[PDB]
């Protein structure tokens, strides 16, 4: 059985900066009751309970790199951090995903893709940012109206960000919603978006 050291399953998968992050081939997952290394940025994890039951009986887990952070020539991929996600007194973010911002006051549409060229199933994660108001939307992504289109051979979804006056959690009033699909071998996930996109950097080759 795996013993997560004061981290939630989501915080470890997305790579929480405060979470240390192990030896694979476990028989059960064991997390804290109220782990301090939560989702540093406020939000939710879609189908979170179904992902936990799917990882209880595993045989191999290895963090591969599906998309390098240096592979972002058309967007800003380093200014994406928040006070709610600290590391050594400095603002950070989840290590396994990339918060993309606009570069030179422009944000073109993304159409990058990736095929699973591995003999094992591939678990990939991604998220959407829900800004505070219209002014924050233009300040981060310029484009007022935006969307996210994630598509696999067995998945098709279109995410639209929402805007509302929310209370502060861990400091910020913004929110982030995280999703996950399984990528069987010889299949490709297709991403199309024009803002509010939390792109993946590392994935997980799993085997049950």
């Amino acid at each position, epitope marked *: 059985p795996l013993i997560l050291r004061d981290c939630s399953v989501a915080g470890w998968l997305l790579g929480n900066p405060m979470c240390d992050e192990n030896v694979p081939e476990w028989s059960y997952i064991v997390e804290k009751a109220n782990p301090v290394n939560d989702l540093c940025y406020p939000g939710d994890f879609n189908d979170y309970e179904e992902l936990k039951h799917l990882l209880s009986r595993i045989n191999h887990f290895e963090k591969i790199q599906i998309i390098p952070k240096s592979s972002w020539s058309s967007h800003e991929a380093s200014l994406g951090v928040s006070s709610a996600c600290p590391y050594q007194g400095k603002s950070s973010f989840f290590r396994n995903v990339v918060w993309l911002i606009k570069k030179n006051s422009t944000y073109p549409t993304i159409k990058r893709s990736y095929n699973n060229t591995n003999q094992e199933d591939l678990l990939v994660l991604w998220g959407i940012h829900h800004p505070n108001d219209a002014a924050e939307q233009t300040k981060l992504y310029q484009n007022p109206t935006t969307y996210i289109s994630v598509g696999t051979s067995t998945l098709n979804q279109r995410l639209v960000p929402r805007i*509302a006056t*929310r209370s502060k959690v861990n400091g910020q009033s913004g929110r982030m919603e995280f999703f996950w699909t399984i990528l069987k071998p010889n299949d490709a996930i297709n991403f199309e978006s024009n803002g509010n996109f939390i792109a993946p950097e590392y994935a997980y080759k799993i085997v049950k």
Partner: antibody, heavy 128, light 110 residues
């Protein structure tokens, strides 16, 4: 953004009374308005939750059947129709707006709702 | 039905001292617990959101903690303007209902 109550006052036992929670600005929407009353000296007790458009509504047990929500579609007004009022309803009625959301703060998610903008309160007195 | 309980009923403390009050739920409400402050003759003000998150315009001396069924609100340095009744409120059962606690009265010793 401010909230203002309207429609309180004196009413006979078994009478009726309309309460309105008028917002002072344009709505981003998908908020709820919550009615909280407070009898003289006692504490806060929940009365009702109403989606700002009026699709969903929920009431506390003490007022079920007696309290309803009505709309005057000639205007843009959402009413809290208090009917069959009795002495246990004499209180100050506050309305507040809160944002309902699902958050992950632990092992599993749950609903979170904080009333962050409140009205000034309106007094309802049930007497002959 | 979730029943919220607060302790103590009232307390008297000098200016500068630390005040501690607790809130309990009859069943686990995760972290969906909020603290409100009601000064005399005024409407409640939201202080803590989701058990432990300060809101804007609230002094840092107000601190919240807790999880499950056990929750604590703390004032690190009591000030005269803090004279109020403090209520915990549970939103784990939203939308069909939410419930308040009995409230703790904070009095000043001078």
């Amino acid at each position: 953004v401010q909230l203002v109550q309207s429609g309180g006052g004196l009413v006979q036992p078994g009478g009726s009374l309309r309460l309105s929670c008028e917002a002072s600005r344009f709505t981003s929407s998908s908020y709820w308005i919550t009615w909280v009353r407070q009898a003289p000296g006692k504490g806060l007790e929940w009365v009702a939750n109403i989606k700002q458009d009026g699709s969903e509504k929920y009431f506390v047990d003490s007022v079920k059947g007696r309290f309803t929500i009505s709309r005057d579609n000639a205007s843009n007004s959402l009413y809290l129709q208090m009917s069959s009022l009795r002495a246990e309803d004499t209180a100050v009625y506050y309305c507040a707006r809160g944002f309902l959301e699902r958050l992950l703060l632990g092992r599993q998610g749950a609903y979170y709702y904080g009333m962050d903008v409140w009205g000034q309160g309106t007094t309802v007195t049930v007497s002959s | 039905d979730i029943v919220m309980t607060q302790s103590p009923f009232s307390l008297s403390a000098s200016v500068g001292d630390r005040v501690t009050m607790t809130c309990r739920a009859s069943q686990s409400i995760s972290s969906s617990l909020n603290w409100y402050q009601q000064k005399p003759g005024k409407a409640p003000k939201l202080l803590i959101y989701a058990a432990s998150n300060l809101q804007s315009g609230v002094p840092s001396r107000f601190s919240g903690s807790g999880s499950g069924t056990d929750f604590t609100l703390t004032i690190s340095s009591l000030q005269p303007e803090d004279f109020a009744t403090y209520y915990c409120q549970q939103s784990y059962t939203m939308p069909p209902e939410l419930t308040f606690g009995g409230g703790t009265k904070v009095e000043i010793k001078r």
